[PDB]
């Protein structure tokens, strides 16, 4: 009911291309745009999409507490919300991943009764998984701010991935336009030596910010981080990835309670699923085409879709309206205000399609766009 | 040099809108598209963007090992790469976050000497941070697969965020079109009781997959997860968020080595930065407008951009070419093949702009698009 809204969106890390379609649609729809980005091509792109943009970066200053900057950034956005404007804040990467003023501005907007939403974006950690060819699932992922990691003595797991953000500004709470020398970097290296040993690999990661750039994926030993010429390479957009040093064994009680053993024993805990983490120290070559793999590939020749497979069975009119709801914030607002009125004014919908949109039920819509074979006789209703 | 390439991209979680601009551009440019997605509107959208698409979901079957499905999915993509095609694989969310066949297919393609890249996307964890209004930085984040969490007895930190994926299929290595009953869910609840206590909150999180849907953000006690009517609500797209139960104190030795104390003591470790995590048990109301905040806001009236602030100073021709490099994979390939030839054939560039593109140096390009004030006299060169 109340006039004014705050939508905070991300740009992703790589210039322009890592922005989501919905982030772009909200930037275009906004009355006012406030942005804080990491390259001028992304800034130029944003200014082509909205006539009313403010750069939040101008609220940093030499020796000015970042906390004071964050308060000001948040207040500039919430002031325009209180005036009844649809405001979009734009932060590079994911706007809620290692960002103070987005969470502050949204909490204030929400607490005062305005519509407030964060749209997720592609973070530096998302880029890290893609560029270093690792999956956080295998074998779990710990993510920390480097100064917080040290000050609160946050635990590491030698059996899981470790990701450290802000390794270029250890112990620095203020700002300088020319960056910092990172004189307390050795305190971080001391902690990594204690946890992992002097010979353990650390990957210096910088995601490409321009589309033609290659990422920095430079493996050093903990010991090599003490060399001044290596330490000096760590800057404002540097992230560290520390791979596991060991594989963790399985718990026999859980194996029993989950009934994972048909009868008795198996080979090993080290018989890895291909591919192996290429950053882990002393990990063996894993065979991609084991006999089991070759047998699975041989079955492709005679493959047919299972009876319970649900083929897409939709229409141009239905795919057009679902695309419009995703890419047009005004259409989505209109639909959310009155499902029936909206549904009945969409041309060329089938009766089922119209009925599904009228209800707004996610399951009805899925059902209208996919063939449900008799065999599927699922429990979606039960 | 070698014919054929594999690019794996994501769709994000929310239908269509959470796809990145670059993911869309690669789907449009591909000779062949292989996809595995979580809603039919996204599937329909992909089929409008490329004439040659294959649904990978048809390679699941009842009682068929997911490992055999993953081998087949990977082989269907690499077969087309070996034939010299530009192949795009599409997985929902981030295609490398809790995905086996993407990493497999890329490692095989890379090992055989083909061009292989993963483009990051918006994961379910990215959605979780946005919808639950938490920052992984505050106070660190542990992310696990629920079965792996139990089988390898992965450590929790009561002082950091915990995120568990695949909580709806504890101990299940195969597949059923109608889903699973999740009969071993109680083994997970037992572990959460041991680590956190019966009264500790667990947030049942499901990101909206359709643009009009609200996310599920349902807080339960560990004890409430034992109620059959609550346990039954956990399905294939369910994630758990477990908030910290305590704030971790600062280490005095690190405080000293980072020189964080001007003279002596301070109030507390609990004087939180606004806003507080709303999911944490028994966390006090934090004041958003402390006297320090009010003073920072009062300074906005007399604010001017600092002398070292670098205003955008570019041209339509330069912003157009940087946008084209981000949104046109063919233009990017042409540019990467011959910087000089490409740069010299861009119309309307200034001499500086042409020179920067000729070099391809990220710093030269940034310099050509931003005004460097004399004051900045930075060390970017030193």
């Amino acid at each position: 009911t109340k006039a004014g809204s705050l939508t905070i969106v991300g740009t992703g890390i790589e210039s322009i291309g890592q922005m989501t379609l919905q982030a772009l649609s909200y930037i275009e729809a906004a009355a006012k745009v406030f942005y804080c980005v990491i390259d001028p091509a992304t800034e130029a792109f944003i200014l082509t999409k909205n006539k009313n943009c403010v750069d939040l970066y101008q609220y940093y200053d030499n020796g000015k507490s970042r906390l004071n900057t964050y308060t000001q950034m948040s207040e500039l956005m919430v002031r325009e919300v209180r005036k009844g404007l649809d405001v979009v804040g734009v932060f590079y990467g994911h706007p809620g991943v290692f960002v103070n003023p987005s969470h502050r501005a949204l909490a204030i907007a929400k607490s005062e009764g305005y519509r407030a939403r964060m749209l997720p974006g592609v973070s530096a950690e998302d880029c890290l998984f893609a560029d270093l060819c690792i999956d956080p699932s295998n074998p779990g992922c710990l993510t920390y701010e480097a100064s917080d990691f040290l000050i609160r003595d946050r635990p590491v797991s030698i059996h899981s991935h470790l990701v450290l953000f802000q390794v270029g500004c250890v112990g620095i709470a203020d700002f300088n336009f020319t960056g910092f020398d990172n004189n307390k970097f050795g305190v971080l290296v001391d902690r990594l030596e204690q946890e992992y040993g002097a010979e353990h690999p650390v990957v210096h990661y910088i995601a490409a910010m321009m589309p033609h750039q290659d990422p920095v994926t430079d493996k050093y030993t903990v010991a090599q981080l003490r060399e001044p010429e290596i330490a000096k390479r760590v800057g404002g957009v540097s992230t560290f990835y520390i791979p596991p040093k060991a594989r963790k064994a399985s718990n026999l009680d859980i194996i029993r309670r989950l009934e994972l053993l048909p009868a008795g024993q198996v080979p090993d805990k080290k018989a890895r699923i291909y591919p192996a983490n290429q950053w882990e120290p002393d990990v063996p070559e894993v065979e991609p085409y084991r006999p089991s793999d070759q047998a699975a590939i041989a079955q492709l020749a005679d493959h047919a879709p299972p009876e319970q497979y649900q083929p897409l069975a939709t229409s141009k009119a239905m795919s057009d309206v679902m695309t419009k709801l995703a890419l047009d914030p005004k259409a989505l607002a209109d639909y959310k205000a009155d499902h029936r009125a909206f549904a009945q004014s969409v041309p060329d919908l089938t009766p089922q399609e119209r009925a599904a949109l009228e209800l707004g039920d996610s399951w009805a819509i899925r059902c209208a766009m996919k063939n449900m074979p008799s065999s599927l006789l699922d429990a979606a209703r039960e | 040099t070698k014919a054929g390439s594999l690019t794996i991209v994501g769709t994000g979680i929310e239908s269509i809108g959470q796809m990145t601009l670059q993911a869309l551009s690669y789907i449009e440019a591909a000779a062949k598209v292989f996809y595995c997605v979580i809603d039919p509107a996204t599937e329909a959208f992909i089929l409008t963007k490329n004439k040659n698409c294959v649904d990978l979901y048809q390679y699941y079957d009842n009682g068929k090992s997911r490992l055999n499905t993953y081998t087949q999915m990977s082989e269907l993509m690499v077969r087309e790469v070996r034939k010299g095609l530009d192949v795009v694989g599409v997985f929902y969310g981030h295609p490398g976050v809790f995905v086996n066949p993407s990493h497999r297919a890329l490692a095989i393609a890379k090992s055989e000497g083909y061009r292989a890249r993963m483009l990051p996307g918006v994961s379910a964890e990215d959605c979780l941070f946005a919808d639950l209004c938490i920052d992984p930085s505050n106070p660190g984040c542990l992310t696990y697969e629920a079965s792996d969490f139990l089988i390898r007895d992965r450590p929790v930190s009561i002082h950091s965020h915990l995120v568990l994926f695949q909580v709806g299929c504890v101990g299940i290595a195969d597949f059923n079109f109608t889903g699973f009953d999740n009969n071993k869910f109680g083994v997970l609840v037992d572990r959460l009781e041991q680590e956190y206590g019966a009264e500790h909150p667990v947030v049942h999180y499901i990101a909206a997959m359709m643009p009009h849907q609200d996310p599920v953000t349902d807080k339960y006690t560990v004890a409430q997860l034992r109620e059959p009517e609550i346990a039954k609500r956990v399905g294939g797209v369910s994630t758990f968020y477990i908030p910290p139960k305590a704030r971790k104190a600062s280490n005095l030795d690190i405080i000293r080595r980072l020189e964080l104390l001007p003279a002596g003591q301070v109030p507390d470790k609990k004087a939180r930065i606004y806003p507080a995590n709303q999911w944490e048990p028994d966390v006090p109301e934090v004041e958003p407008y402390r006297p320090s905040d009010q003073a920072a806001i009062a300074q906005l009236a007399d604010h001017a951009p600092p002398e070292q602030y670098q205003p955008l100073a570019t041209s339509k021709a330069m912003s157009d070419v940087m946008t084209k490099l981000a949104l046109d994979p063919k233009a990017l390939a042409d540019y990467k093949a011959d910087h000089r030839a490409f740069a010299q054939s861009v119309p309307d560039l200034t001499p500086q702009e042409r020179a920067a593109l000729e070099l391809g140096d990220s710093w030269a390009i940034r310099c050509a698009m931003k005004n460097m004030p004399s004051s900045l006299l930075d060390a970017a060169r030193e």
Partner: peptide, 13 residues
Amino acid sequence: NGFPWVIVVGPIG
């Protein structure tokens, strides 16, 4: 060269 410097979180406590 360690640029840019766009740090938008910290201190965390």
